[PDB]
Symmetry: C2
Subunit: 154 residues, 2 copies
């Protein structure tokens, strides 16, 4: 059960300011995982290179989400890093639709085994479809978000 | 210039079938792998690998009222992207991908063959949309094979 084994720590949650670009976001959210040795040193650029060709924007209402990740060979330990954006930043639609997704919540995934992605996505679906959960993520502070996701993971 | 795996995926008419009541989880995986193996879309031992994955990383999804499974294995075992669909006569238990103790009573199986794991997000996003569409899913349990191919084919595009 990937969710039960995923590492999710207090310093894996952060709010990013309104200036951030998509690459800024990905880099900022990789930072904790890199420092914790969960992923390779250059993880952010592999996630960035993947995003531009295979985007990970999920058009969910009212709060758009993205789930950027890369190949399992770049992951040492399973983990999730969460960013809350001050203003929406467009990620391309994962479904191939032409209109961008105005993303406010980023779930960066670091999975050491691709057979785990099904458990993890299934779980992300449950969450991002929870309108009150997702809305509260836009008002909570880093502490509250950690406790809320941490509880949700179980 | 939008990469979109559902657009490219090969879903042919003989990649839809009903199965008889007597089938086991493994019979199902073999029955669904066959046409893909026959078409050279996957390696000859593709079914073995899907079975091996299922044992430790189950692919049952507890959607209601119609349970589903999405059996698949590593990209390295796939030559051409495809989906192979099975409609079961009676439910067959698959273990819950989410890890709950209760098995999923599956009636529809969507075998996935993806040559690049970066495409699984697009495909699973599509699948989650379909299997949570309660009326679409009820129709698959009454439609014939031609109708099902038609229905899923339209839905893919």
């Amino acid at each position: 059960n990937a969710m039960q084994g995923i590492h999710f720590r207090r310093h894996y949650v952060r709010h990013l300011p309104k200036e951030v670009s998509q690459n800024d976001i990905i880099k900022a959210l990789a930072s904790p995982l890199i420092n914790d040795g969960m992923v390779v040193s250059d993880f952010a650029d592999h996630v960035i290179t993947r995003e531009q060709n295979f985007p990970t924007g999920l058009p969910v209402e009212p709060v758009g989400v993205a789930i950027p990740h890369t190949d399992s060979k770049y992951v040492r330990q399973n983990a999730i890093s969460v960013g809350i954006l001050a203003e929406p930043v467009n990620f391309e639609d994962a479904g191939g639709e032409p209109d961008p997704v105005p993303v406010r919540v980023v779930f960066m995934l670091a999975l050491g085994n691709w057979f785990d992605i099904t458990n993890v996505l299934w779980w992300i679906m449950d969450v991002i479809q929870d309108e009150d959960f997702m809305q509260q993520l836009l008002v909570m502070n880093d502490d509250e978000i950690y406790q809320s996701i941490y509880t949700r993971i179980s």
